[PDB]
């Protein structure tokens, strides 16, 4: 069992260090340490092997060290693309491998970014299937938290709502989606529907209509 901090953060251009430590309620001869970077939705990428060595094409901003029952990765000149999860891994004299629990790196100082909101009405094909879904897609916001409220005309609607957690985009901003399920009758019986997104105390609200 190898312990890593859950989170580490630094400002752009700084150095940060991620630890990888044996819990000591154990006893296993750990030998060769490797480190991995994993961006959202991607496979892990080897950054360091045999404690301190970089594969071809890996930035020299990554360095690896080991002392006794702990190893560490230092990232210098921190860049936005370094936001990712990092894992240590060690082989043992028994030819087993053990991963640490992972550390998420945050780059501090990123500015507020207002959400882009795209609202689609039901498609003709879905209405022909006797269903209706309004699709509210929320993207490019920072920090990564929003709340969503739906309206039929001017009245709140809470039934038939399904909203995702926020997810980290490749550009380090965040995305979420919200879906409102209606019957065709309901969709047609109102003048419009709205998806209202609240982010950091300000709203962006989009409206669609059958007519």
């Amino acid at each position: 069992a190898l312990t890593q901090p859950a989170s580490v953060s630094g400002s752009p251009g700084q150095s940060i260090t991620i630890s990888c430590t044996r819990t000591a309620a154990a006893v296993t001869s750990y030998n060769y340490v490797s480190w991995y970077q994993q961006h959202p939705g991607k496979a892990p990428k080897l950054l360091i092997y045999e404690v301190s060595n970089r594969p071809s094409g890996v930035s020299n901003r990554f360095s690896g060290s080991k002392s006794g029952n702990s190893a560490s990765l230092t990232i210098s000149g921190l860049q936005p693309e370094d936001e990712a999860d990092y894992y240590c891994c060690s082989s043992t004299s028994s030819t087993t491998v053990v991963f640490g629990g992972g550390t998420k790196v945050t780059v501090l100082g990123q500015p507020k970014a207002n959400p882009t909101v795209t609202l689609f009405p039901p498609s003709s094909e879905e209405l022909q299937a006797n269903k209706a879904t309004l699709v509210c897609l929320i993207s490019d916001f920072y920090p990564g938290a929003v709340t969503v409220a739906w309206k039929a005309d001017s009245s709140p609607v809470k039934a038939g709502v399904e909203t995702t957690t926020p997810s980290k985009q490749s550009n380090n901003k965040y995305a979420a989606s919200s879906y409102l399920s209606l019957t065709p009758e309901q969709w047609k019986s109102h003048r419009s529907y709205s998806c209202q997104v609240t982010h950091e105390g300000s709203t962006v609200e989009k409206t669609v209509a059958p007519t």
Binding site: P44, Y49, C89, E126, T133, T164
Partner: protein, 226 residues
């Protein structure tokens, strides 16, 4: 180019077994150990074991001893991981990953250089259900700053994952496939949106290619203005 290509995602009932394959190309199979490493949703990497295709030797994590085996078929450069008596908490993406080998010994290192693309295994009694796909047409309401947003709604499927490409993978600029919602019904839905120049809409066709491997179903949908 060294590559590892894994078999497709599937759902398996609790108590069943799953066998995932990993086909190696671009190198002589027997020269490197291959590990299996899994990752439950939102969790960390967990080593399962390795196989040495040259010797047929293996090692497995204590947690899985007696419930996992790893095998290899050299004639087709493929390794396998079979996990039996599946638990709900065996739900995970399973990766195969090649060991780069120690620089100075013909021996494993735990340094894993080339990774397969992963296989999503969902352990659930719920049955597979392929999605319905609907177009999300561009409109003046989805248009701003010279670009228009159009997409596809991928509705009511189980289990994860679904992939969406656009124009058979030729179009990647401005594609945003949003993570799925897990609805109260227990089915997933997702949307994929491509943001394109509005001036392109009269001469460029847009087709979303939706793949739900757990149901072995692919659907292509044309997305046009209405």
């Amino acid at each position: 180019q060294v590559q590892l290509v894994q078999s497709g995602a599937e759902v398996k009932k609790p108590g069943a077994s799953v066998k995932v394959s990993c086909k190696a190309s671009g190198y002589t199979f027997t020269g490197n150990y291959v590990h299996w490493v899994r990752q439950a949703p939102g969790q960390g990497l967990e080593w399962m074991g390795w196989i040495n295709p040259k010797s047929d030797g293996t090692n497995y994590a204590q947690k899985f001893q007696g419930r996992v085996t790893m095998t290899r078929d050299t004639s087709i450069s493929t390794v396998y991981m079979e996990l039996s008596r599946l638990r709900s908490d065996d739900t995970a993406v399973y990766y195969c990953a090649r060991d780069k080998g120690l620089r100075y010994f013909d021996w494993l290192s735990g340094g894993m250089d080339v990774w397969g693309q992963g296989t999503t295994v969902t352990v659930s009694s719920a049955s597979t259900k392929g999605p319905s796909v609907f177009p999300l047409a561009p409109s003046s309401k989805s248009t701003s700053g010279g670009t228009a947003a159009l997409g596809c709604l991928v509705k009511d499927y189980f289990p994860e994952p679904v992939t969406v490409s656009w124009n058979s993978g030729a179009l990647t600029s401005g594609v945003h496939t949003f993570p799925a919602v897990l609805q109260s019904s227990g089915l997933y839905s997702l949307s994929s949106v491509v943001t394109v120049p509005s001036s392109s809409l009269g001469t460029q066709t847009y087709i979303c290619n939706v793949n739900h491997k757990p149901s072995n179903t692919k659907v292509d949908k044309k997305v046009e203005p209405k």
